[PDB]
Each structure stands twice: as structure tokens, then as C-alpha cells.
Design a protein around this ligand. Structure first.
Ligand SMILES: CC(C)CN(C[C@@H](O)[C@H](Cc1ccccc1)NC(=O)O[C@H]1CO[C@H]2OCC[C@H]21)S(=O)(=O)c1ccc(N)cc1
Lengths: 99, 99
């Protein structure tokens, strides 16, 4: 689809058979989701945002379906103000900015 | 143009005598620029992201040129680590997300 920006670009995602709302975030290198359980091994990591650094759990090769478009990649789980889909996954689903 | 998300979507913006590199950021409601001493009335605000909040100065009706495209609107100014072009000005230069 084409998504305009007068409203937040919130989309429904599917991850582990759960439906969640996430923000398509072109300013985010990484995908960061609110606290949730994901299976498999994870690595402790730290990332920085506008307000400082947080601790996250890094899960690799996680499938997420974003508006029915399939991605498989790295998901960070931790204290984010909102679920955000970053460039790592937006690139996989073919997302570009256009003006 | 079409801006790839393989890399951070940095573009050149102008605000007065200053040329800056700024992210086209769909996850940012409002434009926030690195510390600079703009003229005019402003109001204090706190904006929040990953890591917590920063204090900013909200200036209204500030003209900014984004890759040659004219915009005018709210510009938040404060100790952000990166210059961010938010939705408020992206809409004005015709910017959509597409996949
Ligand atoms: C988290 C969002 C809901 C809001 N953020 C915009 C976001 O695009 C920032 C924009 C951003 C970018 C770099 C540094 C600080 C903020 N990105 C960000 O935190 O991404 C993190 C996840 O991937 C990593 O890559 C970049 C930092 C990490 S925000 O910067 O906090 C923000 C909040 C409010 C406004 N008005 C403007 C910006």
C-alpha cells in the first residue's frame, strides 16, 4: 500500500500467532517490541534512543507478517514507548519513502 | 525522489543560514532538531522515546527547506542526538511510505 503521514503509520503485525499494533518507524535502525515472550535463545543487548539507553533482549530470525508482508529477522524486546518496526524489517518488505 | 531504507534516510535541510543532515522519520510526530538558537517565541515541552524523555523548546511556524521542498511548521529544539524531520513537515513535502 501507500501510507500517508497525517496520522501515525500504525499497522497490524502477526508474531507468534499474536496480533499487535506497531509503528512503522523509518528513524529506527532496529525493531523494538514491548515486553512479550518469544521462544528460543536471546542475547542481552543495549540500545540508545532519544532519551538514553535501555536494555533489550535480542531475538534473531523471528518471523513477523507486516500488513500481510512476510519478514524474518532480528527483534528487540524491551521498554519502548510503543512497538516499532525499524529499517531492518521494513527493508525486507520493500518499504521506501517517496515524495 | 525514492529514498531507500537500506541506510538511514538522511536528507539535507535548511533552516536559516544553516544546512543540516536530518532523518525523514515516520516514527516522529514532530520535527526535533539539535540544539540551536532560533529567534522568536517558544514554549517548553517534554518528548519521550526509547530511554525516556528530553526537554525541548517548541517553536511555531518556522520555515524549513527539505531537499528543495518548502515547509513551515512546528520545530522542536533540544538535546537530541540526531536531527529529526517528523510527520508534521513530511506531509507538507508530500512524503509517503510505500511497499
Ligand atoms: C521511538 C519513537 C516512537 C519516537 N522516536 C523516533 C524514532 O524514530 C527514533 C529516532 C532516533 C534515532 C536515533 C537516535 C535517537 C532517536 N528512533 C529510535 O529510537 O530508534 C531506536 C531503535 O533503532 C535504533 O536506531 C536508532 C536509535 C534506535 S523519538 O526520537 O523518541 C521522537 C519522539 C517524539 C518526537 N516528536 C520526535 C522523535
Amino acid at each position: 500500500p501507500q501510507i500517508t503521514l497525517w496520522k501515525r503509520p500504525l499497522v497490524t503485525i502477526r508474531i507468534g500467532g499474536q496480533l499487535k499494533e506497531a509503528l512503522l518507524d523509518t528513524g529506527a535502525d532496529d525493531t523494538v517490541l514491548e515486553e512479550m515472550n518469544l521462544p528460543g535463545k536471546w542475547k542481552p543487548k543495549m540500545i540508545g534512543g532519544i532519551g538514553g539507553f535501555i536494555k533489550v533482549r535480542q531475538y534473531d530470525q523471528i518471523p513477523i507478517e507486516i500488513c500481510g508482508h512476510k519478514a524474518i529477522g532480528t527483534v528487540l524486546v524491551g521498554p519502548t514507548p510503543v512497538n516499532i518496526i525499524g529499517r531492518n524489517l521494513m527493508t525486507q518488505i520493500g518499504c521506501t519513502l517517496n515524495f
